């Protein structure tokens, strides 16, 4: 079950700035032509976010912290990213959350998983489902429409929070044509679900699919290739935001009060 | 005006009274058309409840909440509702209802509340301080007790740290209570965190089992998939009414709106915190709520030691256009300040005796009468 | 448009009466200011053709 | 901006009224600022405290607005008395007073 | 020195005293100009050149 | 308790601000008088008595 | 220096903004008073030697 | 006001409560001035069978 | 006693029965370290207009 | 400055009428690649 993809291609982590991104509707209320000041876990403006690549032989799916929240943005064109994994130790000793996506559906579980180091999915093109070697004490299950739907054209932005015992996800899909990094601009994330997983989360990891079509050797850390793909991770902090609203009810603008004295 | 001045005599002048009120005539209710009844039996009348350390959470949706069905079946020793009054549960609709069920001993029922401490609260089941919901409990000695002991119910006794609200820890790992590490094996100063409740019919009320159900929900601010037994009525527009949209009472006029609400949005607010819009659950159409009271009212009177007849100035009324007036009169004069009733226009011009408004002054003259 | 809040406010007391007294005094003062500034002459003089 | 004083007067009045309107979104230590959520969720006796909090806060807001209006009215009265003196001494006569 | 000095206490609690837009020396310069004008020229400098 | 203290300290600040406004009005009256005195006594000769 | 009290004050409302508006108006008024009193002459006249 | 109920229902004897007793048998006003007293009577109001 | 501030050595002398110290306001401007029995001065960290 | 340290503005030895009343005797303005001056 465990194919260690220990291809050794060391590249330094690349950092980028998030101009104005990660803004989400704090509440399920309608407001129009009004400026509203709210305090919630937001991604600070012009924040130093990490950059990860999956281009060839570079694969980036390390374990990352979940301090208070995550702004996950993926510029993709092949649905290589299929979901994420959340947990503390990512082993059978503790419960963990798994979000994965089959074509036209989603699988969510909060069940003791002995996650497989270098977890992944595969493309030939269903292929492989090597993510966990075990599932025990399985408590929560849920299925819904795909969270991820269809060079680097679509920008899937996700915000994850683990308030008290509810896992909240805010998502948005924005088509673009930029191929280098985040498109400077604006877009608000609407709420998607509020999962009552009721677990403890401190670390998370991303699940990327691999392509093995032209030739298939012993499927070790070899005979695999990842299409061009990258994702950006930003950590939210308690911040006070001034949100603008238009006639329709969309935000369209915001201000980070603590960014600098001018914004304050 | 006399009540406002706390006197029975009003000296000559003009006074400002309360704005024009219109009292509502109808009282409508609009709940989603739901006929199914909530799974009261499966939550309260189900055998084989879960242990506190692995408390089960059940989602509840698309059901009417008529708790009167429980009166004949079961009686609850404890029933506390936080963030809502029990009397209003029949007139409310709930957004995200979750039923958390488990079994504990009577001594530990008090621990099921925000701000408490103990093994249950700290290690097994913790409630948030800002908790909206209700807590229910009832003895189950006749059910969860057996001769010789029932050890199927367990509770976490040792943990490295206190739990966070609505957090479940099913981990079964040997607790290290000392500096010496023990790896997956029980030993001196090392304990198995889980322990079994000793439930017997003979033991006291304190150690007797208690089946606890915790209902967590949000009131308003979002679509309400669960509703009470109150009956909906027909829709009324362009008329002051006492509405109830998914438990949100109020008073105002309802009209069609051009606003577009996203699927997750039910209510709408203005610069203030006030529901200026709402979505009808049955018709899925947007409505605009507008207060019915609107317009200043001013009273023009002489000293009342000279005459008891008065004139009323209705600001924000254009009689030149069922006017928003308390009582219509034969003499109506329109002014830039507003419609003046009870005073007759005279084409002459005198010094101002009573400063009505823009360029209009009243007086008492001539069978005397009020003039403008 | 709430009966309960109004019936509570009746108990809380009558400070709004004095608020309105102050505002009415302000308004009358504004009218007096306008009269004092401009209405310095009662005879209305017309410019000759 | 020849007439800055008059426009500032108008803006001050409008801003005061708008602030008074927007101070109705303040919870004043209560559970809400809508007065309908309180009545719907809570029974009368438990809602009395919240409604009293909101009444106290809004009364304080109104009193503050009234006090500010009184002070501004005093300033405007001073200006109007000066204007009347100027009309009388400069328009209706020739003033030897300097400036 | 905060509990001792009053300004430090006022300033650890959010209260600050802003500096005036005109220094004492500049006000003295204005006054000296006025004295020189009223001495050399009289009341003419207040009406023009 | 924190709401009680917030309300009390806000009231204290509002009282201080109101007193400052009134004192500023008084000082403005004094300053206007001083400007009138400069203009009429320094920049000219005043026939006004006292 | 308390996060909890600050996050409560955000709810209690924005009256401090208008407090600061009043204080800023007072300060600007003081500067205007000083200018009106002393800055009556823009030409700076020097006393003759 | 005297009557007999079961222990589980004693909590219902208070303003603002709900249940069969409060809703259908005996209801107290919200603005209630008085005292509520209760004591077990199994030895008196109970019989074999 | 929680709080937030800077801690520095102090010349204050505390009697045996005294642990904390206060200022003109009700605010802990001084404290005694239980382990070292030395006086400390608590000073707010936020200071200066912007 | 006697009011305090000013950052983001360059001192100019010239003297103009006050556009922005910083403090004691210092006034800022926007001038000249434009930049802020004190
Ligand atoms: C959630 O899990 C984290 C660990 O993933 C817990 O934090 C650890 O706590 C232990 C002691 O209990 C320490 O030895 C570790 O150093 C901590 N790790 C980190 C990263 O802080 C945390 O306590 C757990 N939360 C709850 C509520 O139990
Ligand atoms: C079973 C799931 C129902 C959930 C409905 C939403 C919650 C609405 C409140 C219902 C509370 C019922 C508690 C029991 C009522 C009192 C009964 C009694 O005192 O005998
Ligand atoms: C290699 O794979 C095996 C699968 O049996 C696993 O036990 C081991 O930890 C892996 N090692 C690394 C470095 O990934
Ligand atoms: C992000 O952090 C790295 C290392 O701390 C730093 O070199 C980089 O300059 C930062 N980002 C920007 C935009 O400066
Ligand atoms: C494929 O999707 C179906 C439902 O759409 C789901 O039941 C199934 O588990 C998915 N397959 C995989 C391998 O995830
Ligand atoms: C989890 O599963 C294991 C393996 O069957 C079992 O031994 C353990 O009791 C389970 N834990 C539960 C049900 O809490
Ligand atoms: C607001 O909605 C209308 C449709 O009702 C649309 O025509 C208009 O473009 C929207 N406003 C903006 C700024 O997009
Ligand atoms: C459900 O209630 C009925 C009577 O109301 C009772 O006879 C039955 O035993 C209950 N169900 C269970 C599982 O106890
Ligand atoms: C029931 O409500 C739905 C909307 O939820 C509506 O489409 C339908 O017409 C309603 N049916 C009746 C009989 O009112
Ligand atoms: C006012 O009332 C008194 C007492 O009734 C009466 O004597 C007097 O004539 C009245 N004045 C007028 C103007 O009617
Ligand atoms: C009142 O309405 C009429 C039309 O009905 C219009 O001609 C007139 O100007 C209006 N007057 C005012 C004061 O609004
Ligand atoms: C008064 O003026 C109205 C028109 O404003 C006219 O209809 C009426 O006949 C006039 N009456 C007298 C007595 O002049
Ligand atoms: C323990 O505290 C005392 C003061 O109460 C101190 O004198 C001693 O040095 C401390 N010992 C250690 C090991 O910290
Ligand atoms: C401006 O004055 C400073 C000293 O205050 C001096 O160092 C600098 O050379 C001067 N520059 C010009 C252009 O006069």
Residue numbers in the entry:
A (entry chain A): 14 to 69, 77 to 144, 153 to 178, 185 to 298
B (entry chain C): 299 to 619, 632 to 676, 689 to 694
C (entry chain A), G (entry chain B): 745 to 793
D (entry chain A): 943 to 1041
E (entry chain B): 844 to 892
F (entry chain B): 992 to 1041
H (entry chain B): 398 to 446
I (entry chain A): 546 to 595
Publication text:
The SARS-CoV-2 viral envelope is decorated with glycosylated Spike, a large (>1200 residues per protomer) trimeric type I fusion protein. The first is to attach to receptor(s), with ACE2 identified as having high affinity for one domain of Spike, termed the receptor binding domain (RBD), and many neutralising antibodies function by abrogating this interaction. The second function is to act as the machine which fuses the viral and host cell membranes allowing the viral genome to enter the cell. This multistage process is not fully understood but it is thought that receptor attachment destabilizes the prefusion state and cleavage of Spike by host protease into two major fragments, S1 and S2, releases the metastable protein to undergo massive conformational changes, discarding the S1 portion which includes the RBD.
Here, we report a high-resolution cryo-EM structure for the 2P version of SARS-CoV-Spike ectodomain, revealing a tightly packed arrangement of the Spike trimer with all RBDs down. The comparison shows that for the ‘locked’ form, the NTDs are rotated by approximately 7° and slide inwards towards the RBDs by ~ 7-10 Å. RBD packing around the 3-fold axis also leads to the ordering of a segment of S2 (T827-F855) where Y837 interacts with the main chain of the adjacent protomer residues P589’ and R634’ (’ denotes neighbouring protomer) and the side chains L841 and F855 form a hydrophobic patch with residues V551’, T553’ and F592’. Careful inspection of the ‘locked’ structure revealed the presence of elongated continuous density extending deep inside the hydrophobic core of the RBD ([Fig fig1] and [Fig fig2]). The density occupies a curved pocket lodged between the ß-sheet and outer α-helices of some 589 Å^3^ volume ([Fig fig2]) not found in the previously reported ‘all-down’ and ‘one-up’ structures. The length of the density is consistent with an 18-carbon fatty acid such as stearic acid, and its curvature suggests an omega-3 or omega-6 fatty acid with at least two unsaturated carbons ([Fig fig1]). In the absence of a formal chemical analysis of the molecule we have modelled it as stearic acid, however note, by analogy with enterovirus pocket factors, that there might be a mixture of lipids. The fatty acid fits almost entirely within the pocket (85% of the surface area buried) and is stabilized by a series of hydrophobic interactions ([Fig fig2]), whilst the polar/charged headgroup is exposed at the end of the pocket where it faces a neighbouring RBD, interacting with R408’ and indirectly with Q409’ ([Fig fig2]). In addition, the first or second glycosidic rings of the N165 and N234 glycans make polar interactions underneath the tip of the RBD, opposite to the ACE2 binding site: GlcNacN_165_ with Y351’ and GlcNac_N234_ with R457’ and S459’ ([Fig fig1]).
